[PDB]
Amino acid sequence: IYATIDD
Amino acid sequence: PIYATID
Amino acid sequence: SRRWFHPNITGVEAENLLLTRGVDGSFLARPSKSNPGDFTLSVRRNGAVTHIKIQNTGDYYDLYGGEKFATLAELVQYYMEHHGQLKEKNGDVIELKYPLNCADPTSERWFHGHLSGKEAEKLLTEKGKHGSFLVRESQSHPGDFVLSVRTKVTHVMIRCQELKYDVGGGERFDSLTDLVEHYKKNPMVETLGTVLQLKQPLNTTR
């Protein structure tokens, strides 16, 4: 599973 | 940036 | 589809692309901006560019008129191979002569182009170190890209929307190399704690 990135 | 039509 | 379909551009960028990289008779297809998810044929004639709308009905494609087709590629083939079937309001004929190829987003060697998640995981684990990274095309969301990083291997979607490159949100970047250079200096953090350090590239071998 591809990964997510928040900011 | 103009479109067109054939018909 | 890369020989003639450009998923991340607009009428304006198609114009510029046809006028710089192309010749009269050069054409491409692209997503529609005035009605998604129709498609649009942009064509170069006698030094200028015209845009033709393709209808997407779900069962076929046509040009809001004319013959109907199962695929976009069959529609494009038809209008390449039957001359005079495409005429403006003035009755000028539109000729679809030369497909304009969708160029790669960069020429740096960490870009692997068509390459799967699994092929990336193999190359990186059996030929990279911790923090080895590459970029490839997305097979789950064609048109997008993926940053593949050794840490186990993590995949981060790179979205391309209106010629901008972001990592799902945050700063949109001019070129794919701006985004990569920027995230080497300033590591990104996955939302499970893992820091995705881009330490060294895993370059293509040919």
Q: Chain B contacts of C89, Cβ < 8 Å?
A: 4-5
Distance from chain centroid for Cα C188: 24
* Residue type at C159 in one-letter notation: R
Q: Chain A contacts of C167, Cβ < 8 Å?
A: 5
Rounded CA-CA distance C90/C46 in Å is 15
Rounded CA-CA distance C32/C147 in Å is 27
Q: Where a domain ends, among C104, C137, C155?
A: C104
Q: Chain B contacts of C94, Cβ < 8 Å?
A: 4, 6
Q: Chain C: which residues have CB within 8 Å of chain B?
A: 11-12, 15, 34, 50-53, 63-66, 86-89, 94
- Residue bearing tokens 């551009």: C9
Q: Which residues contact C186 (CB under 8 A, 6 or more apart)?
A: none
- Residue bearing tokens 């692209």: C30
C98 and C161 fall within a common domain: no
C5 and C75 fall within a common domain: yes
Rounded CA-CA distance C14/C169 in Å is 25
Q: Which residues contact B6 (CB under 8 A, 6 or more apart)?
A: C52, C63, C64, C65, C66, C86, C87, C88, C94
Q: Which of C11, C15, C86 sits opposite B6 (nearest CB)?
A: C86
Which residue out of C156, C171, C183 would a mutagenesis test of the A interface target, given it has the greatest number of A Cβ atoms within 10 Å? C156
| Structural domain containing residue C51 | 1-104
- Residue bearing tokens 């008129």: C65
Rounded CA-CA distance A5/C159 in Å is 12
Q: How far apart are the first and last CA of chain B?
A: 20
Q: Please, are residues C112 and C134 in contact by the beta-carbon 8 Å criterion? A: yes
Number of domains in chain C: 2
C97 class by beta-carbon count within 10 Å (0-12 exposed, 13-18 middle, 19+ buried): middle
C112 and C100 fall within a common domain: no
We report the CATH number of the domain holding residue C141 as 3.30.505.10
Rounded CA-CA distance C110/C120 in Å is 11
H helix count then E strand count, chain C:
4, 12
Rounded CA-CA distance C35/C56 in Å is 10
C123 and C99 fall within a common domain: no
- 3-state DSSP assignment of residue C18: helix
Q: Chain B contacts of C50, Cβ < 8 Å?
A: 2-4
Of C133, C138, C149, C182, the C-alpha closest to C8 is C138
Alpha-carbon distances, residue C2 vs C6, C36, C46, C101, C103 (angstroms)? 7, 20, 25, 6, 8
C124 and C151 fall within a common domain: yes
C47 class by beta-carbon count within 10 Å (0-12 exposed, 13-18 middle, 19+ buried): exposed
C10 and C96 fall within a common domain: yes
Rounded CA-CA distance C143/C7 in Å is 5
Pairing relationship of beta strands C164-166 and C153-161 according to DSSP bridges: antiparallel
Q: Where a domain ends, among C104, C119, C149?
A: C104
Contacts 24+ apart (CB under 8 A), C145-151: C145/C105, C145/C176, C146/A2, C146/C117, C146/C120, C147/C180, C147/C183, C147/C196, C147/C198, C148/C117, C148/C120, C148/C121, C148/C124, C149/C124, C149/C196, C149/C197, C149/C198, C150/C124, C150/C125, C150/C202, C151/C194, C151/C196, C151/C197
Q: Where a domain ends, among C104, C129, C157?
A: C104
Q: Please, are residues A7 and C169 in contact by the beta-carbon 8 Å criterion? A: yes
Which residue out of C51, C62, C67 would a mutagenesis test of the B interface target, given it has the greatest number of B Cβ atoms within 10 Å? C51
Q: Please, are residues C105 and C158 in contact by the beta-carbon 8 Å criterion? A: no
